């Protein structure tokens, strides 16, 4: 699991989090998460010890050692954390909950207490470290975009659709575009203004994507920065290139046939460490490694009692 | 029953309080007796 | 006024338009009407302009000349729109009462009243007898003599529609109530007497039977318990307990009493040595042998009331078994017109509702011969009851005026709401009733269906349904309806009813009546639907609401549970209508309630501010907030909102075709239904 | 005993109001006659003198029927009930099969099947002509609800 370059972890309803083999397909061992679901995973830079954001309580476990009993146990939260950042030198770990407060995570200190606070009106969906390590995108339920600037505190709230939930957003590694979704289905992309000492940060919105139908769930950028995909409630998890903003290709988990209701949403979406290959998450209980170019499914992991709402993907050599 | 009726108490409770009643009224007469109350009964239950 | 606004400028201009049309026509309604609410709106705006500018010497002296200028007309106005109404002048005597409460201290202001009390006709106070007695203490001493003095004439004709609150008032607990109403009774007795004494014991023998000593206790024990093992409070649970030892301090008055106070009484006096040793001592071992013996006696309790399903008269209470033939009225059924249904005499068994509550089956013989069903609710206040059937009174008679409405027969069911003290009082049992919840669990049972088999579902696809996030809650809910056909109630509604032509009446006043009750309900504010506390009639097919404990939109500001949904339409009711869906008779029903409701808003605000400002009923805000009169003005202003349609967006005003769209849509939203409360039962 | 229902059922040769009038008669008469229960075979006498009896018994002498008839003579029955509605109807013989149809809704056992969808489509015709718009609406929105 840790001493595997690239890790694999799984976790939905079942209370297990499961790290798989990539190369294999094969569960290498289940880790307990009793008292809640989890909600988003997340592997640390680093890669000592991976994250597990849950309900009242973010857990951290041990990505080296097997079988062990959660490293860390943040409690003092409440009506769930939605997800959980990381700074990439590996002190600061940031959160995002449904009480409308979002907060910074000391983990070298031993103080339970967090240390920062960023309040806001509406609960918070979704959070994104922005690369160069200084802002903070903030995304909540009202449709209010922030920026909560992690020196001045100077958060740049910004509306691009009044009262529409904005689900997820994420950031291409280069800090070119930044790209939001809502439950209306629809993908605001957004030009960076290239300012770091400035901080100005300047969100230009390029083009609305009428990407899906039904709700859509997460978009993230590739490392590459050329492909964004964006899932939905539609059972299909359609990658839009960034260049032209076409769909390159759709890949689908439908029946294939029009009597099958609610197969399951799709809320996966993390490229491989060289854009070739694309791992999706779905609620049919199955995780599936797809293929970018192609769009095959090339191996699919079973064995979750429950949904799948979570993945976790490192291939940091 | 037994001057006593029985859907007015509901049906458990009514059971116990003829039991009760029926050992005084007997008691008038018998005062110096071991009274043992069977209600709805089994046969094992009567064997004993 | 639409173009302009209302200003330092055009009310001089209105005024003297108005004025004009008076003159013009004298004996038109519509000319004294808006002469008089227009001098009230300019009493208003010069009112919270001073507190806007002044709060925020002279300026009050000025005010009172300034106000005082717009007050003498608008109450000879309002007088003289009373009289020409003769019928419809609800909102004009509401505003009578809120000029009078408010500045009626004045001298001038108090001369045109007495003038005006007299010239206006004696029935017409009777709408507002309730809205009368809530101010039957107020402080101010020139206001209060002429309250007792009206109220003094009420009760010399049309007692009966004075005695019931009175004797409520008359037990109040603050003295200054009571004293007032007793004085008033005191002048009442004079004419009748008889009705006086009937009403007082009969009120006080209802009281009894609606809680007895066991009840009592119970209810008692069960908040000393919680006060000491859960808060550790002791002197707060003496507070509680030492109450119901000064009830038992009277002694046995019924036969119930003293089979009580035999087999509990012996044990509960013994436990209050231990709490009089306690209070000189401070003991734990002395306080742990008193909750021995309270517990003793609360489990022999909550083992006994399951048991006691029927109250006999005869032991319950005797009195009330005595009473034969008198002539105090069938409570909710005087009217000045119709012969009076005086009571003939009471039934002798009490049907207990097996409830939480344990809500009686009172039922009372007429003279005229019919029975008269009521429902005896304890520790309930009724008071909001009685003030929201006046407000279903209003838009009744709006709604019989309108014509569209009148052909559509739109009205909204209601029933009699009579309260006795602040705990207890008499509700009217509407019969042919029975709530949706136990339709549906009949029919499920009927049909071998489990009744708990969409909430089952979710729990088996995600356990943990309570504690995940709202995307996931969407899936599982949608999952749920998805693998749930959701017709129960449009299929038992077909198998109930004899014939399709039956079936046909019965399906379409469901749906114009359900409509109704939407719109009106959203804009009171009514929430905390859910199917036990709405009920179908099995004959005209007619939606009834009961329990409106929530008010203004309590359920959203509370923070457990909270509900974003304004009034239930969930899929079930939707396929109980026509097969096309809302976009049938329920959108165009909408369109004309909400119309006729925006033409008239100046009524309905009217009686809304009224009762919402009472001193009585602002605890129920003062709960919600968290002074109490700046969380009232915001709640009015909320109101108005609604009424003018810019709820929504404040900046932009919305036609009624427009609201109407947007509500559909956010109760029907999938994202709010499943925040709901799993009891509100989202899924049918 | 389903030898005169037979010829009841596959007669077919009535060219008037009063002949269809007649199979009613028979038919009615020949269900109490069958009829397992003898509160209902007891009216059988009084039902030949008095019309009316006949006809508030129609429902339950068919449902009493139906049950026994072990398949082949419920579509036996089945059959001539459609050809009858079908061919030659008759307005009042019409809406009696129509408040028949109807009760067997109601009824645990289920509505009859004939040609298929519970003849979802005939009744409604049927309805259609005998003015019976409420019937005609219920039936027309079951046929909406399958397509």
Same mark, same amino acid.
């Given at each position: ?317 | ?48 | ?197 009937? %009403? ?62 035999? %087999? ?25 042998? %008193? ?170 696809? %995600? ?222 | ?147």
């Amino acid at each position: 699991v840790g001493s595997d370059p690239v890790i694999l972890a799984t976790a939905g309803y079942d209370h297990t989090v499961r790290f798989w083999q990539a190369h294999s397909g094969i569960c290498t061992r289940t880790v307990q998460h009793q008292d809640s679901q989890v909600n988003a995973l997340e592997v640390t830079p680093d890669r000592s010890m991976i994250a597990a954001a849950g309900y009242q309580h973010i857990r951290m476990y041990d990505l080296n050692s097997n079988n062990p009993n959660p490293i860390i146990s943040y409690d003092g939260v409440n009506k769930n954390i939605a997800s959980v950042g990381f700074h990439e030198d590996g002190r600061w770990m940031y959160t995002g909950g449904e009480d409308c407060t979002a907060r910074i995570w000391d983990l070298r200190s031993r103080n339970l207490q967090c240390q920062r606070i960023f309040q806001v009106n509406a609960p918070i969906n979704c959070v994104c470290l922005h690369p160069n390590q200084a802002e903070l995108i903030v995304g909540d339920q009202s449709g209010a975009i922030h920026i909560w600037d992690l020196k001045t505190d100077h958060n740049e709230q910004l509306i691009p659709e009044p009262e529409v939930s904005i689900t997820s957003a994420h950031i291409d590694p280069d800090a070119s575009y930044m790209a939001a979704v809502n439950s209306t289905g629809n993908c605001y992309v957004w030009n960076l203004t290239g300012g770091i000492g400035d901080e100005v940060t300047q969100l230009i919105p390029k083009t609305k994507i009428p990407a899906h139908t039904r709700y859509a769930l997460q978009c993230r950028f590739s490392p590459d920065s050329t492909l964004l995909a964006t899932c939905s409630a539609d059972q299909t998890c359609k990658i839009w290139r960034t260049s032209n903003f076409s769909l390159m290709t759709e890949l689908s988990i439908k029946s294939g046939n029009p009597g099958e209701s609610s197969r399951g949403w799709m809320w996966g979406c993390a490229f491989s460490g060289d854009s070739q290959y694309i791992v999706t998450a779905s609620s049919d209980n199955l995780a599936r490694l797809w293929c970018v170019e192609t769009g095959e499914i090339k191996r699919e992991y079973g064995g979750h009692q429950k949904a799948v709402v979570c993945l976790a993907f490192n291939d940091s050599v | 029953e037994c001057w006593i009726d029985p859907l007015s108490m509901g049906p458990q409770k009514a059971l116990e309080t003829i039991g009760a009643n029926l050992q005084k009224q007997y008691e008038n007469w018998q005062p110096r007796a071991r009274y043992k109350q069977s209600l709805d009964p089994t046969v094992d239950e009567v064997k004993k | 006024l639409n173009l302009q606004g209302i200003n330092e400028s055009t009310i001089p201009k209105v005024l003297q338009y108005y004025s004009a049309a008076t003159e013009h026509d004298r004996s038109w309604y519509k000319a004294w009407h808006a002469w008089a609410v227009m001098n009230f709106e300019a009493v208003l705006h010069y009112k919270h302009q001073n507190q806007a500018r002044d709060e925020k010497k002279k300026v009050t002296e000025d005010l009172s000349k300034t106000l005082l200028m717009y007050t003498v007309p608008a109450v000879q106005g309002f007088f003289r729109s009373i009289s020409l109404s003769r019928g419809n002048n609800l909102q004009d005597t509401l505003r009578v009462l809120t000029l009078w409460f408010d500045y009626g201290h004045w001298p001038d202001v108090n001369e045109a009243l007495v003038e005006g009390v007299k010239a206006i006709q004696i029935d017409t106070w009777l709408q507002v007898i309730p809205q009368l007695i809530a101010r039957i203490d107020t402080p101010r001493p020139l206001v209060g003599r002429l309250i007792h003095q009206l109220l003094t004439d009420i009760g010399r004709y049309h007692p009966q529609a004075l005695i019931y609150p009175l004797t409520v008032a008359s037990k109040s607990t603050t003295t200054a109530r009571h004293n007032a109403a007793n004085k008033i009774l005191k002048n009442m007795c004079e004419h009748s007497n008889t009705l006086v004494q009937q %009403a007082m014991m009969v009120s006080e023998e209802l009281i009894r039977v609606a809680i007895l000593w066991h009840e009592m206790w119970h209810e008692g024990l069960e908040e000393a318990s919680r006060l000491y093992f859960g808060e550790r409070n002791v002197k707060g649970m003496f507070e509680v307990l030492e109450p119901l030892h000064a009830m038992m301090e009277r002694g046995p008055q019924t036969l119930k009493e003293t089979s009580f106070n035999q %087999a509990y009484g012996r044990d509960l006096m013994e436990a209050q040595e231990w709490c009089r040793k306690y209070m000189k001592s401070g003991n734990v071992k002395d306080l742990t042998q %008193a909750w021995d013996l309270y517990y003793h006696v609360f489990r022999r309790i909550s083992k006994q009331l399951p048991q006691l399903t029927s109250l006999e008269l005869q032991y319950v209470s005797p009195k009330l078994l005595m009473c034969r033939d008198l002539e105090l009225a069938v409570p909710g059924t005087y009217d000045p017109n119709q012969p009076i249904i005086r009571i003939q005499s009471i039934a002798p068994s009490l049907q207990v509702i097996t409830s939480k509550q344990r809500p009686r089956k009172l039922t009372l013989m007429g003279s005229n011969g019919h029975e008269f069903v009521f429902l005896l609710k304890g520790h309930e206040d009724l008071r909001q009851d009685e003030r929201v059937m006046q407000l279903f009174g209003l838009v009744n008679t709006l709604l019989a005026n309108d014509p569209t409405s009148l052909r559509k027969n739109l009205s909204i069911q209601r029933y009699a709401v009579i309260p006795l003290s602040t705990n207890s009082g008499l509700i009217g049992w509407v019969p042919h009733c029975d709530t949706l919840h136990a339709l549906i669990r009949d029919y499920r049972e009927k049909k071998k269906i489990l009744l708990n088999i969409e909430h089952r579902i979710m729990l088996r696809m %995600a356990p943990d349904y309570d504690h995940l996030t709202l995307m996931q809650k969407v899936e599982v809910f949608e999952h749920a309806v998805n693998n749930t056909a959701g017709d129960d109630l449009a299929k038992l509604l077909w198998l109930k009813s004899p014939s399709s032509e039956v079936w046909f009446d019965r399906r379409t006043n469901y749906t114009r009546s359900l409509a109704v009750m939407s719109m009106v309900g959203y804009i009171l504010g009514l929430g905390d639907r859910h199917p036990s506390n709405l009920m179908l009639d099995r004959l005209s097919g007619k939606i009834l609401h009961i329990d409106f404990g929530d008010c203004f939109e309590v359920a959203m500001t509370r923070e457990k549970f909270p509900e974003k949904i304004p009034f239930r339409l969930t899929r079930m009711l939707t396929n109980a209508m026509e097969v096309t869906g809302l976009d049938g008779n329920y959108r165009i029903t909408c369109h004309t309630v909400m119309e006729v409701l925006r033409e008239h808003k100046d009524s309905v605000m009217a009686v809304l501010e009224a009762f919402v400002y009472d001193p009585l009923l602002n605890w129920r805000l003062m709960d919600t907030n968290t002074a109490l009169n700046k969380k009232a003005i915001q709640i009015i202003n909320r109101v108005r909102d609604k009424l003018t349609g810019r709820d929504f967006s404040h900046d932009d005003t919305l036609d009624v075709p427009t609201q109407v769209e947007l509500l559909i849509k956010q109760a029907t939203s999938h994202e709010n239904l499943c925040q709901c409360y799993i009891g509100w039962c989202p899924f049918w | 005993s389903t030898i005169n229902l037979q010829k009841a059922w596959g007669a077919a040769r009535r060219v008037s109001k009063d002949d269809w009038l007649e199979w009613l008669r028979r038919l009615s008469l020949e269900l109490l006659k069958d009829s397992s229960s003898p509160s209902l075979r007891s009216c059988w006498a009084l039902a030949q003198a008095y019309n009316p009896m006949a006809r508030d018994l129609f429902n339950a002498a068919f449902v009493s029927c139906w049950s026994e008839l072990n398949e082949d003579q419920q579509d036996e029955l089945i059959r001539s009930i459609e050809l009858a509605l079908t061919s030659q109807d008759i307005a009042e013989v019409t809406q009696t099969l129509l408040n028949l149809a109807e009760f067997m809704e109601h009824s645990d056992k289920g509505p009859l099947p004939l040609r298929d969808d519970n003849g979802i489509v005939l009744l409604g015709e049927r309805a259609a002509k005998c003015r019976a718009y409420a019937k005609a609406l219920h039936y027309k929105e079951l046929e909406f609800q399958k397509g």
